[PDB]
Every structure is written in C-alpha cells, then in structure tokens.
Amino acid sequence: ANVETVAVSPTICRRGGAWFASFGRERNSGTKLFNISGHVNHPCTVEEEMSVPLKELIEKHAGGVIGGWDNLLAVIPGGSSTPLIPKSVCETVLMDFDALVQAQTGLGTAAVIVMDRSTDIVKAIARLIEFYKHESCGQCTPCREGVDWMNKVMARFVKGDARPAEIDSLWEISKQIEGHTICALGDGAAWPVQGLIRHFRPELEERMQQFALQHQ
Amino acid sequence: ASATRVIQLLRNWASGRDLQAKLQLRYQEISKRTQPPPKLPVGPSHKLSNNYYCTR
C-alpha cells in the first residue's frame, strides 16, 4: 500500500468514512496531495480537494503559469507516466481519476508538471523516454528492447532527422509495447509518446521539414 | 550494309521487296552494351506502418 494511502487510514477511521466521502465527486472521494512543478511561479506541494479544477489549483496554490495563463503550452497532470494535455484541455479539466481518464490521460500521482510556450515539447518528452530507458529492469522483451528503440527514435525526432512516416511507425511501436509487458513500466513509457503524437504531431513534422531543408 | 547499288537493285528485284528497309543483320541501331545504373522501385509491402503481416 502506498504511504499516502496508509497515512490517511487512521484519520479516516477516527472521523469516519462518510466525512472522507463527502469531498470530491462520486467515486473520487477525499483529499489529495498535489506537487506542482515546472513553469510555475511558486512550485510547491499542497493539499486540496480531489475534484478541484487544474486551472484553479495552478493559479491559486502555485502562483500561476510563468508569464500568465496564456503562456501555457502543456501540462502533465499525474507524473511522467501520464500523457500530456494541451492548454485547451487544461482550462476546464478536473483533477480526479475519472475526469482525467476522460481527458485521455490519468490522475497518476497527481504530480502536475507545467510547460510554457517557451518549452521544446519534443525534448522534454525525449528526456522522459530516456528516463524510462535508464529505469527499465530489462526482464521482459517488449520493455527491454522497445523502450530503448523508442528512446533512439525520439532522440532523432528532437533533431528532426527522421521522416514523417516514422511518426506512425513510432505509434505502432508503443502499441506493441503496451499491454505485452510484465509490469506497467511499459505502459508508462508508451503513454507519453502517444500523448506527444496525439497533440503535437505538427511540431514533429515541422522540425523534420527544417532538418530536411537545412541539410539539403 | 556495304552492298553496292547494282547488287542492291538485283536483290530487290529477285526478292520483289525493299530489302534494305528491314535488314536481318543488326548495326548501330541496337542498344549500347554499357548502360546507366537502374533504381528498381520496391513493392507495396515496403511500409513503416499499417503493414502487419497477418493482413497480407
């Protein structure tokens, strides 16, 4: 059992199940610890109700996005394993399990990483993929080989060295890895790539166009 | 063809045809024995996605 799960049980028993139940939406009960990091004015750890909107959380407790809310480019809402969502989704999304699932992402650890419009969105996800490459235990074939393969492909994507067709190839690679591994580290490596492809395909194609142009 | 004109005319009359038009022996018209390199395209299965073998 996770430490946060363990450490709220004595308070839950003392105040009763119902008190904990009232907070948050139905089936998304209680309070939650949020870590807001990245491109915010006051990165911090705070306690907040479950189904609080993401914008409310960022602007109230973290001081807002660096350079204003309109400067926001993307948010990873639940730690590195959850897919990113662009600004247009972050404006009304709620920070619970079911709402973020509906937003094609996850609540995860409730670790909100904020990236403003000055961020190289491809490079940040490539760094996350490199993290997963260095953390794989190497036991099962799909993670051990495919995470390293995706790391190489993403390192090339940062420069723009590849061709646009490879984008779809990369997507398929992630699908091969996902659901075929002993544990969920494969899921956690496949999901951020899928989010990047889903929401920032034009950036990848545009970078590839620049690389092909400059190298003639 | 290096045949003289009178022999050419005799050949045409004996055969009844214009023999010089379609000569069996082949000269300069045929393709050169040295050719530029080809490129040779690839088949429909040379794709990076949407190409699972169980569908083909």
Ligand code: SF4
């Ligand atoms: S998916 Fe899990 S078990 Fe398989 S290699 Fe990666 S970390 Fe190891």
